[PDB]
Write a protein that binds this ligand. Structure first.
Ligand code: HEM
Ligand SMILES: NS(=O)(=O)NCCNc1nonc1/C(=N/O)Nc1ccc(F)c(Br)c1
Length: 371
């Protein structure tokens, strides 16, 4: 019911690679975005389409692949070549089906993390394991944007977190059964798997270039909420009356970090600050099943209060290890932002952005029991 895989966690277990033949006009545009943008034929070829209906998309993986295809097409149409020439209105041939599809999956009509990472992958050899060399994305925007490296490294962090996520039922089951040793073991295991996820994060340096990321890829993943280039928003023609605002694709849209914040009693979304508000808004951009999972974790008894009541140095230490793993992940993530956003931007927007991430990191570090 929560749609969480044992192996790949929040990611889609094995994404559908082909659409039905009825939507071959969509798939051809999405498969050839690098050429169609560079040549300048994308906007024209989207302009002259047919309003294809949603009813032939039968199952969930088909509907998700359609969201990814239509999402990638919508980014490249709006942002064009990505040198400031923008379209303020999305044609009703593409906008109506995309909006009707998006209402069915309870997601906004914009490319989200669930599309371009969680559903945008495949294994080359099905009989080999989930490593970077054996994997590839389904869609990219331009040549030399490093879509593969960025989406797959994000995906591999989701996969690393799946080892911790599958232990969560043991944590709550151990608390109700009043089983101290099982709980201690489950927390050390979660801490161990979140420590492993940090090493997976290191691969970002191997497969993504700062200048390629900042110049090319960042422009296509940006949205139309609080954006000067579309201050009113994007007009979805033939569906909504006025231009609607929707935030761009981010890995703040991931459920991984929020999952373990809620599990460990770290009250990020508590208070009325910008950090709390941002993280609560990012839930709207997650699949409904994953929102329901985060709701379910909030509804359960507090792991934090359970551990604090027992006067047990082993349980406190194990709970701290989980918290420390999250702090370390966010601490490393700040370094990435310095390398991949701050330095390229230089060669108070940068200051506020780092203070956001540091507020979230500080809220995490405040939850430690020893310090
Ligand atoms: C080049 C790589 C990366 C850059 C430049 C980057 C940049 C950022 C920025 C600027 C934010 C602030 C929110 C926003 O304005 O959208 C953010 C938030 C976030 N990023 Fe990344 N990021 C990168 C890679 C990753 C990866 C691989 C993950 C893996 C899951 C990740 C997870 C997050 C999360 C969870 C947040 C939400 C804030 C939090 O919970 O601490 N990011 N990122
Ligand atoms: N204008 S801004 O400050 O750069 N805001 C956007 C920042 N976030 C990002 N920009 O570019 N990738 C980002 C990001 N950060 O965690 N994660 C991310 C990871 C995988 C994806 F498929 C997508 Br889509 C986003």
């Amino acid at each position: 019911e929560y749609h969480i895989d044992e192996e790949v966690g929040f990611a889609l277990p094995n994404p559908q690679e082909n659409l039905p033949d009825f939507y071959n006009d969509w798939m051809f545009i999405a498969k050839h975005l690098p050429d169609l943008i560079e040549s300048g034929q994308l906007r024209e070829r989207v302009e002259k389409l047919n309003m294809l209906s949603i009813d032939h998309l039968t199952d969930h993986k088909s509907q998700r692949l359609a969201r990814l295809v239509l999402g990638c097409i919508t980014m490249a149409y709006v942002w064009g070549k990505g040198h400031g020439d923008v379209r303020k209105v999305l044609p009703r041939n593409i906008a109506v089906p995309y909006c009707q599809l998006s209402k069915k999956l309870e997601l906004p009509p914009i490319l989200v993390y669930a599309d371009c990472v969680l559903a945008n992958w495949k294994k080359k050899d099905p009989n080999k394991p989930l490593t970077y060399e054996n994997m590839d994305v389904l869609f990219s925007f331009r040549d030399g944007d490093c879509s593969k490296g960025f989406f797959l490294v994000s995906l591999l962090v989701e996969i690393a977190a799946a080892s911790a996520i599958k232990v969560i039922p043991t944590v709550f089951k151990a608390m109700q059964m009043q089983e101290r040793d099982t709980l201690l073991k489950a927390l050390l295991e979660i801490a161990s798997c979140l420590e492993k996820a940090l090493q997976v994060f290191h691969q970002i340096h191997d497969h993504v270039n700062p200048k390629a990321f900042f110049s090319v890829l960042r422009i296509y993943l940006s949205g139309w909420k609080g954006n000067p280039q579309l201050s009113d928003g994007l007009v979805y023609e033939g569906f909504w009356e006025d231009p609607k605002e929707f935030a761009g694709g981010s890995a703040g849209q991931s459920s991984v970090f929020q999952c373990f914040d809620v599990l460990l009693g770290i009250q990020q979304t508590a208070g009325g600050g910008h950090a709390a508000q941002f993280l609560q808004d990012m839930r709207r951009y997650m699949p409904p099943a994953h929102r329901n999972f985060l709701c379910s974790l909030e509804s359960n008894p507090s792991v934090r209060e359970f551990v604090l009541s027992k006067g047990d140095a082993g349980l406190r230490e194990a709970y701290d290890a989980c918290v420390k793993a999250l702090v370390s992940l966010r601490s490393y993530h700040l370094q990435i932002v310095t390398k991949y956003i701050l330095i390229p931007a230089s060669q108070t927007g940068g200051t506020d952005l780092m203070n956001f991430l540091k507020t979230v990191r500080s809220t995490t570090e405040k939850s430690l029991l020893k310090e």
